[PDB]
Structures are given as structure tokens and as C-alpha cells.
């Protein structure tokens, strides 16, 4: 009975820890995707600025 | 005769001028296309 109670009590805490870890992993993935999108947008803006500047000098 | 041949144009100047006009038109078209491409930049 004590082993069954220990298994029942540890399951809820383990599930809560797993959910917290999954939420943290999802937040980290969302932050990485946002950083990658911002980097791509900045690279596109810089490419456009360089292309506009090159057409003036030539 | 040597000074006349020194110019460089071996073939008659008719086809030379035709090709020069064609190259000028091509250069103008390329410049206009490059300007139109580098002007319309509104993406994000």
C-alpha cells in the first residue's frame, strides 16, 4: 500500500514537472524562431538597402 | 594606309554601327530594368 501511494503521489509531481519542462522548451523554441525571423528580416532589409545603394553608384 | 588600318574596324562600319546601336539599346534596357527592380522594394 505504501508503494502504491508513493507511485500515485510521484506521478502527479512528475507530470507537472514534465509539463513545466515542455512549456519551457516550447517558449525557447518560440524565442529561437522569433530571433531567426528577425534576423531574416534584417538581412532582407540590408540586402535591399545595399541593392538600392549599388544602383545609385552605377 | 597603315594609319587608316590602325583604327581597328576590319569589317565595314555599317554592321559596326548597327551592332553599336543594338548594344546601346541593350544597355539602356538593362539600366532601365535594374532601376525598376531596385526602385520597387516595399517587401518586409
Curated annotation (Swiss-Prot), chain A:
One of its GO terms (molecular function) is ubiquitin protein ligase activity. GO terms for biological process: positive regulation of transcription elongation by RNA polymerase II; positive regulation of transcription initiation by RNA polymerase II; protein ubiquitination; regulation of transcription by RNA polymerase II; RNA polymerase II preinitiation complex assembly; somatic stem cell population maintenance; transcription initiation at RNA polymerase II promoter. Disulfide bonds: none annotated. Coiled coil: none annotated. Its main location: nucleus. Constitutively sumoylated. Keywords: Activator, Isopeptide bond, Nucleus, Phosphoprotein, Transcription, Transcription regulation, Ubl conjugation. It is found in: Nucleus. GO terms for cellular component: core mediator complex; mediator complex; nuclear body; nucleoplasm; nucleus; transcription regulator complex; ubiquitin ligase complex. Component of the Mediator complex, a coactivator involved in the regulated transcription of nearly all RNA polymerase II-dependent genes. Mediator functions as a bridge to convey information from gene-specific regulatory proteins to the basal RNA polymerase II transcription machinery. Mediator is recruited to promoters by direct interactions with regulatory proteins and serves as a scaffold for the assembly of a functional preinitiation complex with RNA polymerase II and the general transcription factors. Component of the Mediator complex, which is composed of MED1, MED4, MED6, MED7, MED8, MED9, MED10, MED11, MED12, MED13, MED13L, MED14, MED15, MED16, MED17, MED18, MED19, MED20, MED21, MED22, MED23, MED24, MED25, MED26, MED27, MED29, MED30, MED31, CCNC, CDK8 and CDC2L6/CDK11. The MED12, MED13, CCNC and CDK8 subunits form a distinct module termed the CDK8 module. Mediator containing the CDK8 module is less active than Mediator lacking this module in supporting transcriptional activation. Belongs to the Mediator complex subunit 7 family. This is Mediator of RNA polymerase II transcription subunit 7.
Swiss-Prot record, chain B:
It comes from the Eukaryota. It is found in: Nucleus. Residues 14-41 form a coiled coil. The modification Phosphoserine is found at residue 12. Belongs to the Mediator complex subunit 9 family. Component of the Mediator complex, a coactivator involved in the regulated transcription of nearly all RNA polymerase II-dependent genes. Mediator functions as a bridge to convey information from gene-specific regulatory proteins to the basal RNA polymerase II transcription machinery. Mediator is recruited to promoters by direct interactions with regulatory proteins and serves as a scaffold for the assembly of a functional preinitiation complex with RNA polymerase II and the general transcription factors. Component of the Mediator complex, which is composed of MED1, MED4, MED6, MED7, MED8, MED9, MED10, MED11, MED12, MED13, MED13L, MED14, MED15, MED16, MED17, MED18, MED19, MED20, MED21, MED22, MED23, MED24, MED25, MED26, MED27, MED29, MED30, MED31, CCNC, CDK8 and CDC2L6/CDK11. The MED12, MED13, CCNC and CDK8 subunits form a distinct module termed the CDK8 module. Mediator containing the CDK8 module is less active than Mediator lacking this module in supporting transcriptional activation. This is Mediator of RNA polymerase II transcription subunit 9. It comes from Homo sapiens. The lineage of its organism: Eukaryota, Metazoa, Chordata, Craniata, Vertebrata. The chain holds residues 99 to 142 of 146 of the full protein.
Amino acid at each position: 500500500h505504501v508503494h502504491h501511494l508513493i507511485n500515485e503521489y510521484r506521478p502527479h509531481q512528475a507530470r507537472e514537472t514534465l509539463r513545466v519542462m515542455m512549456e519551457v522548451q516550447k517558449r525557447q523554441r518560440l524565442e529561437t524562431a522569433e530571433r531567426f525571423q528577425k534576423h531574416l528580416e534584417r538581412v532582407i532589409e540590408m540586402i535591399q538597402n545595399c541593392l538600392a545603394s549599388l544602383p545609385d553608384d552605377l | 594606309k597603315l594609319i587608316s588600318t590602325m583604327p581597328g574596324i576590319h569589317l565595314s562600319p555599317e554592321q559596326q554601327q548597327q551592332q553599336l546601336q543594338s548594344l546601346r539599346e541593350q544597355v539602356r534596357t538593362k539600366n532601365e530594368l535594374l532601376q525598376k527592380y531596385k526602385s520597387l522594394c516595399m517587401f518586409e
